[PDB]
Design an enzyme around this catalytic site. Structure first.
Site, mmCIF file in Angstrom:
data_model
loop_
_atom_site.group_PDB
_atom_site.id
_atom_site.type_symbol
_atom_site.label_atom_id
_atom_site.label_comp_id
_atom_site.label_asym_id
_atom_site.label_seq_id
_atom_site.Cartn_x
_atom_site.Cartn_y
_atom_site.Cartn_z
ATOM 1 N N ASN A 197 -3.352 -9.934 4.953
ATOM 2 C CA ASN A 197 -4.358 -9.321 5.834
ATOM 3 C C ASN A 197 -4.794 -10.400 6.966
ATOM 4 O O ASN A 197 -4.931 -10.283 7.689
ATOM 5 C CB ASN A 197 -5.202 -8.163 5.545
ATOM 6 C CG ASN A 197 -4.856 -7.144 5.060
ATOM 7 O OD1 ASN A 197 -3.726 -6.625 5.003
ATOM 8 N ND2 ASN A 197 -5.669 -6.314 4.210
ATOM 9 N N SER A 213 -3.612 -2.263 12.777
ATOM 10 C CA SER A 213 -4.581 -2.292 13.646
ATOM 11 C C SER A 213 -4.961 -3.658 14.187
ATOM 12 O O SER A 213 -5.926 -3.426 15.113
ATOM 13 C CB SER A 213 -5.758 -1.721 13.231
ATOM 14 O OG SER A 213 -6.510 -2.236 12.105
ATOM 15 N N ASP A 243 0.844 -1.209 0.184
ATOM 16 C CA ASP A 243 0.005 0.027 -0.059
ATOM 17 C C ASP A 243 0.579 1.314 0.080
ATOM 18 O O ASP A 243 1.882 1.498 0.873
ATOM 19 C CB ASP A 243 -1.124 0.202 1.382
ATOM 20 C CG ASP A 243 -1.867 -1.237 1.511
ATOM 21 O OD1 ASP A 243 -2.152 -1.851 0.343
ATOM 22 O OD2 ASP A 243 -2.278 -1.463 2.381
ATOM 23 N N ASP A 261 -11.251 -8.322 6.621
ATOM 24 C CA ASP A 261 -10.041 -8.988 6.823
ATOM 25 C C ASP A 261 -9.739 -9.610 7.854
ATOM 26 O O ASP A 261 -9.195 -10.916 8.199
ATOM 27 C CB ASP A 261 -8.906 -8.439 5.966
ATOM 28 C CG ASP A 261 -9.315 -8.302 4.322
ATOM 29 O OD1 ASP A 261 -9.963 -9.237 3.815
ATOM 30 O OD2 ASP A 261 -8.575 -7.411 3.877
ATOM 31 N N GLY A 268 -23.554 -6.640 12.764
ATOM 32 C CA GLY A 268 -23.184 -8.143 12.944
ATOM 33 C C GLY A 268 -23.145 -8.989 11.668
ATOM 34 O O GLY A 268 -22.561 -8.838 10.883
ATOM 35 N N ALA A 297 -8.521 1.316 15.663
ATOM 36 C CA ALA A 297 -7.376 1.926 15.272
ATOM 37 C C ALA A 297 -7.189 1.879 13.994
ATOM 38 O O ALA A 297 -7.811 1.420 13.038
ATOM 39 C CB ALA A 297 -6.121 1.234 15.909
HETATM 40 K K LIG Z 1 -8.578 -0.120 11.253
#
Ligand SMILES: [K+]
Ligand code: NA
EC number: 2.7.1.15
Lengths: 312, 315
Positions: A43, A296, A13, A255, A226, A290
């Protein structure tokens, strides 16, 4: 011995942060650039590994700087790179991402070396796959390669988790019949079924269309609401709600969810499906709190111990 | 001893080729990605060096993979990297470029480590600057740092070649008075003067405005139509036309022209200005005949010998 094997994509990325998104013809300045590690395969593998899974990533990157850094990234997350191939014939996959202040973005994906992972590269991973508990695939590599991976997992009795993402309208029907767990989001179900999916009610209708195409278990994720789940043994759609979280950055949340799900299929096979999906939703919800994608994803040490406990 | 010192920017170009340009919220697939070396400073320096100049590149890049590659690029072109600083505090400067089939594009520039080159970084380069023949600056680093470089070159009697690019409407007046040679394109002259510049005739008007702000020599490049020049000693605009070429890729051509000019100011100071410009135009035109910016810049060995001769003076 890897219990979780992921056959899928690695992407570098290349992220620029700006105040506005540029229009056609425009040169703008941003205020920060950084390189991150992405790709649905990688991921999912990273989240599974940070939960404590022994994982192995079968993928192909370029024989270039980005690819050597990607390999290092996998090793830093304790993922086996025994079947991470490198090739001179294409560059490492890249996602060029511009993000404004609102958090909106424009993304250009060049799949590159990911599209050259072939059947021979998988054959060489045959022993590893035969010893795993779960095989995970997505749709960011050549579709024939993902099919062959799922075919191999089926032959060896290994559970197959398939995430049809990004979704395509005309998907090969074998993907459904080769999937023990077929997991997608609302947006992807709309593409695969042509139906609208805004609510749990809508999702149950779309999941049934998918179930009838041959999946064993269908899961449609609904973001903050959910997910809904159906299976051959329990065809009634079941909604599994999630306690509302405060969302910083939802990138990579899907992911995170699939990786958590791989982890539970592999190490907690006797949990009920509902219980796995509750825990996977929780973990994904941590990741949305995050910024970043892989950065994160929470580690086991930072999560409540009840996510790793199981009653008799 | 470096005769040409360039104080300016190094930028990694991250280029994605697509069929459409994406809109807000869109993910698209492109068909090719590649990395190129750019930045006006470095581009100019690379052309000067490939003409045979001893150059030195004063810039700042990141302590990251792109920055190490950039330093390797500069060394591969025989440029001194003594004052190519690396910093862990920001990433190497980047230009992210998306290009569609129509050839239109979206560009996002993050200057990064280039903006952190400061006056203390230049003061360490002081000996190198005082021994040069020419100092070249642009406007891709902090403008105060470029000013201080030009000031240091002036104090040591070093000739100053200033390329105000990208151009800004409100340019500090000291840039004009610190410039021995002030070189820009039509498009930049429009921004700096506020005038319209669509011809050689118009370019002569805009050049006179700039001359009246205090430059010694003003040069406005006109792409395929060559350039127009005027000076304090010869204020009548002079149009210098160039041989027509079939243009493959013009990217970096302006930088090739400035780098050639730096080379001639440094090593052929007694050529007439008109002569230097004729030669620099030709060199820039060669660059437009190939793709790839720095990789299109010609080496001395590939150029005609008369570009390196001067009546009764060995080189
Ligand atoms: K995130
Ligand atoms: Na060129």
């Amino acid at each position: 011995v890897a219990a979780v094997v992921v056959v899928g994509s690695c992407m570098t990325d290349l992220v620029s942060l700006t105040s506005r998104l540029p229009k056609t013809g425009e040169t703008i300045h941003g205020h920060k650039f950084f390189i991150g590690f992405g790709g649905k395969g990688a991921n999912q593998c990273v989240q599974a590994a940070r939960l404590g899974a022994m994982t192995s990533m079968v993928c192909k990157v370029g024989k270039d700087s980005f690819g050597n850094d990607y390999i290092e990234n996998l090793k830093q997350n304790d993922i086996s790179t025994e079947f991470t191939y490198q090739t001179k014939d294409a560059a490492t996959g890249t996602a060029s991402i511009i993000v404004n202040n609102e958090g909106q973005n424009i993304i250009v994906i060049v799949a590159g070396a990911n599209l050259l992972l072939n059947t021979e590269d998988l054959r060489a991973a045959a022993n590893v796959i035969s010893r795993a508990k779960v095989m995970v695939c997505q749709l960011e590599i050549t579709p024939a390669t993902s099919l062959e991976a799922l075919t191999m997992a089926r032959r060896s009795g290994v559970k197959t988790l398939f995430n049809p993402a990004p979704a395509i309208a005309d998907l090969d029907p074998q993907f459904y019949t080769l999937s023990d767990v077929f997991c997608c989001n609302e947006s992807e179900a709309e593409i695969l079924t042509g139906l609208t999916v805004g609510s749990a009610a809508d999702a149950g209708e779309a999941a049934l269309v998918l179930l009838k195409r041959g999946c064993q278990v269908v899961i449609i994720t609904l973001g903050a609401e959910g997910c809904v789940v159906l299976s051959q043994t329990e065809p009634e759609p079941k909604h599994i709600p999630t306690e509302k979280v405060k969302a910083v950055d939802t990138t990579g949340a899907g992911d995170s969810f699939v990786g958590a799900l791989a982890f539970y299929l592999a190490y907690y096979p006797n949990l009920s499906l509902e219980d796995m999906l509750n825990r996977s939703n929780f973990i994904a919800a941590v990741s949305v709190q995050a910024a970043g994608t892989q950065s994160s994803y929470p580690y086991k040490k930072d999560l409540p111990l009840t996510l790793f406990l199981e009653h008799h």
